[model samples]
Target chain A: KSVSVILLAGPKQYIPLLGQPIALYSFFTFSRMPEVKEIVVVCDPFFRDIFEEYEESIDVDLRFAIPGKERQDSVYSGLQEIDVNSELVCIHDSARPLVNTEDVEKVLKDGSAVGAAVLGVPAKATIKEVNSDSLVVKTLDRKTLWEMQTPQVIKPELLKKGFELVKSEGLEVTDDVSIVEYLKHPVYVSQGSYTNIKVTTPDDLLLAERILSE
Target chain B: KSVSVILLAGPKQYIPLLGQPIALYSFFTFSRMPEVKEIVVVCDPFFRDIFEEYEESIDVDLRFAIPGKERQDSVYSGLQEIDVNSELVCIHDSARPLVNTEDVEKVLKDGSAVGAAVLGVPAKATIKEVNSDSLVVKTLDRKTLWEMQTPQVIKPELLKKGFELVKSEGLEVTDDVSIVEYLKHPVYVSQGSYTNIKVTTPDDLLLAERILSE
Candidate 1:
């Protein structure tokens, strides 16, 4: 039941979300879950003090690791810092701070059941496959489409293997699930909330503030 | 510059969006555009009185057409009610009330240039092409992926042909733009704002309310 979480501290993490940094939001949620034994934040060594300072406010073990040039590189960096007894690892972007505890638990349980799972919402709009000429190739079946989000949970070894394959093949991917998918290992799509949006542009942060205001 | 606007009046149209009906939101935006010559709302005749009463509040000519069993049928029904002088037809779902005039105008002008254009936003999440068994087939390039939205504008004759093709083929589609896409007619994807969201669930409504509150 031991689970470790890696909050990818991208550029958005430092951006003030409401009164505090966006990075502080998710770890607060993760620390609440009894099964989440360790919280490792993958950030530049430069922000070590910022993340370490907040450790006193939280109950769980908080650790910081230097990020890598690429996102998967950062994930591996965080994976190396977790508790040795941790059986599963959950990766999420601190950018999506509005992600609540309930959805995170849903994904956590599902991942534990099958050894791999990632949270996502059903695609709300019809998607089109377009070509280089800017012509519509085809409209994809919306029923089959799911926009992959974070709080992606998987067995520690499986995730480590995915990172290993990425390094060997020189694969370029934006999300963690994609790495697992390349290995042909099973991954489940845990249905998530639209309210769990990534705070990128100020427009996105505005929506997160609105959700938090209530 | 003459364009006829069709507002697909679905079940959610009557829901009070910030004290006003959701259906009334886009037409209010359309009525403000001098180029938007007419507004045709496709809905049940039962709501004719509700729509007609609000007609006095706007400047553009308002009309209603009885909806069909399917969404495309309802679109075609509204198509027949538009002014014959219209050179371009703009179609949108009333569920997306946050659509601003600026995005609509951008799509409209693009459609006029290429004969067909639809507004969409760059996909934020990495998309996977999953199969029927839910196993991930492969990860798709995020750069080309777009979540298609409303305010899809097309030339009147081109849109009419798309509907005609749908009638002949019995093709099922969730959006009007797909009909044109199947015909191999060039359709442009006009960049849109994330602020242009559809209010299907209450969570979505909350976000829209928060946006409007400011």
Candidate 2:
């Protein structure tokens, strides 16, 4: 019944979103989740001092981990700091601050049964495969396409096994679910909302504001 | 140098957007383009009278065509009504009302040189392949993916050849550029705006209005 969350906040050099640090949004949201028992943040060394300030001010039990060179490295780093009593671990990107609570619960429930699960939305537009030069290689079937989002949940030992596979094969992944996928594990997909967008570029900031305002 | 436009306004029963027919937005945008010579609309019979009223009110050279059962059929039907003097043709969907004039001009300028081109935006999320039961298959390289948008332009004769190939091979396409792709003709890809979204679901209506407001 115990669940832990690992929040990847990236580097401290990342710009502040809407007057506050972006990682704080995930902290606020995960704190509200009744199912979550422990929360750990993996971020750059420079940002550790500011987070310690929040840990004292906030009511939630919080821990911190220094991130590695790559994102997968950060996830593995967070894995080491999770509570030993916890059975399920939920990995999320702090950039995806708009994540809804219902979607989070859905992933937690679905993943607990299969040991690995994630949130994703279907492709609304026709997807094209292009070469290195950006030439259209072919048009993929839109029916088979799904766009991956965060709040990827998995069992503690299962994620460890997946990370071991990543290290042995020397593979780099963009999302946590991909690591589990490489291990030949059945990662269930739950329906995620369009508002669960990851803020990567400048335009996404305005979009995130508008979505929140409404 | 001359370019004609085909606007596909699905059917008569299509929902009204912002107190006007969905097709009116594309007509308004294309009318302001100095490079465009004529605009032909393909729709159901019931909406013909309302569009004719607009034709009398607006200053653009507008024509109408009866749509067939399939979307390609409707497109080919519109193709026959294009001005014989037109060298390049631009095809667009009426549902994509948020299309901006700048994206339209970019496609027109880029397509005229190669005889085939279309508008698309780079995918913001990691795309996944799923099997029939909604299971994860694999993760696609996000750098090589693009979501196809409208304002697909091609040479008139080349488009006709493409339609013939569709009938000969019984190929179904999601976008107009795929028709040219079947002909082994190079269709250049141009960068499109994130604001250029197609209105399919009810949530899209709210998103479209927000985009317009900003």
Measured by TM-score, the strongest candidate is 1
What local distance difference test score does each model get?
0.84, 0.83
Cα displacement (Å) at residue A20, model 1: 5.2
Tens digit of per-residue lDDT, candidate 1, span A1-214: 3999998994678789878888878878998888888899888888777778867777678888889988878888898998877888999898888888999999998898878888877776788877676657777787778888899898988888888898888888777877777888888888889888888777677768878887
lDDT of 2 at B80: 92
Tens digits of per-residue lDDT, candidate 2, A95-121, equal 888898899999999899888889989
Highest lDDT model number: 1
lDDT of 2 at A56: 64
Question: What DockQ does every candidate get?
Answer: 0.53, 0.52
Q: What number of clashing residue pairs does each candidate have, in the order they appear?
A: 0, 0
The candidate 1 chain B region of ten consecutive residues with least summed lDDT is: B129-138
Docking quality category of candidate 2 according to DockQ thresholds: medium
